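so i finally got all the pieces together for this one. its two components total, 139 residues if u count the protein bits. some of the lines might not be protein, just check the labels. i wanna see the whole assembly predicted at once instead of chain by chain like last time, that was a mess tbh
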Amino acid sequence: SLPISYSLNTRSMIAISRTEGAVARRALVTVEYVDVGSKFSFKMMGYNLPNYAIGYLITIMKNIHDGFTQVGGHKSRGFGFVKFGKVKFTDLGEKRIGDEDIQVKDVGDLVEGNGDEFFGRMKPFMEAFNNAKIPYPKK
RNA sequence: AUUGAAAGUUUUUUUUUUUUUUUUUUUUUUUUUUUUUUUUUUUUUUUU
């Protein structure tokens, strides 16, 4: 991902607090993060992906977008939360790959827009993936 | 002092020419630099 409008900002958590005792300063630490509002170009590509696999990838992306999943170092402190404002989806090739694929409504090839309407557009893919009997592994 | 002898088996001729150890063969397949840490305590906006 290539930053576009990136802005760097530091923060220090040198604070050791009361430490449930008497000492209020024992150690020191500071971190450098990327400030909010930065923009990164995100691109990923897939080969011979069936409809259910694409829907599952879209489900992963939606979980990331909603905030249920976070990316970064200090996730417990609420450091990594990213959202999509403009994402294009281009499909080239066949519509279904395997016999296990669900025939999805033809949404075309170029799917784009704001993040919310984007995920609203990929509803058929996620619905097909959820309503897909996954054969493998046989076990 | 042999019946009794005096003659190099020698000259001359390049084992040479033709022929690429060559074609095909992606040092790649997988792994989130995360993880625990409160920028906290002390100080009367105040006198001849």
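Helices of chain A lie at 51-66, 115-121, 123-130.
The longest strand of chain A covers residues 8-12.
anyway lmk what u think
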